Amino acid sequence: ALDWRSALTADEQRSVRALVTATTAVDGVAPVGEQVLRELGQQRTEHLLVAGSRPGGPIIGYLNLSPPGGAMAELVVHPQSRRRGIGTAMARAALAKTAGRNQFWAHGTLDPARATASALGLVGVRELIQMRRPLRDIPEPTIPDGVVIRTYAGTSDDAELLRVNNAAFAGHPEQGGWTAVQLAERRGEAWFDPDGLILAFGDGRLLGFHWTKVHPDHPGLGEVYVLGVDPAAQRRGLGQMLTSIGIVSLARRLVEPAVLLYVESDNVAAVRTYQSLGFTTYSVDTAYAL
Ligand X SMILES: CC(C)(COP(=O)(O)OP(=O)(O)OC[C@H]1O[C@@H](n2cnc3c(N)ncnc32)[C@H](O)[C@@H]1OP(=O)(O)O)[C@@H](O)C(=O)NCCC(=O)NCCS
Ligand Y SMILES: CC(=O)SCCNC(=O)CCNC(=O)[C@H](O)C(C)(C)COP(=O)(O)OP(=O)(O)OC[C@H]1O[C@@H](n2cnc3c(N)ncnc32)[C@H](O)[C@@H]1OP(=O)(O)O
Binding-site residue positions? 34, 75-77, 83-88, 174, 213, 223, 227-229, 234-240, 262, 267-272
Task: Please state, in angstroms and rounded to a whole number, the distance separating the CA atoms of residues 212 and 198.
Answer: 8
The DSSP 8-state label assigned to residue 287 in this structure reads: E
Measure the N-to-C terminal CA separation of the chain; round to a whole number of Å.
Answer: 24
Within the chain, residue ranges assigned H as helices are: 10-27, 34-39, 86-97, 111-119, 158-168, 180-187, 238-253, 268-276
Q: Strand pairing partners for 262? A: 130
Smaller CB distance to ligand Y: residue 76 or 250? 76
Q: Segment 153-212, which members bind ligand X (CB under 6 A)? A: 168-169
Query: Among residues 222, 221, 202, 201, which one has the least CA distance to residue 212?
Result: 222
Contact call for residue 228 and ligand Y (CB under 6 A): no
Q: How far is the CB of 44 from ligand X (least distance, A)?
A: 26
Q: Which does 178 bind (CB under 5 to 8 A by kind): ligand Y, ligand X, none?
A: none
For 154, residues 6+ apart whose C-beta sits below 8 A from its C-beta are 194
Cβ-based nearer residue to ligand X, 97 or 163: 163
Of 39 and 230, the one with the shorter C-beta distance to ligand X is 230
Residue 267: which of ligand X, ligand Y, none does it interact with, CB under 5 to 8 A by kind? ligand X
C-alpha 168/C-alpha 162 separation (Å) is 10
Stretch that binds ligand Y, among 117-125, 151-159, 179-187, 188-196 (CB under 6 A): 117-125
Going by the DSSP 8-state scheme, the letter that residue 78 receives in this structure is: -
Give the binding site for ligand Y (CB under 6 A). 27, 31, 75-77, 82-88, 91, 104, 106, 110-113, 115-117, 119-120, 122, 288
Point out which residues bind ligand X (CB under 6 A): 168-169, 226-229, 234-240, 267-270, 272-273, 276
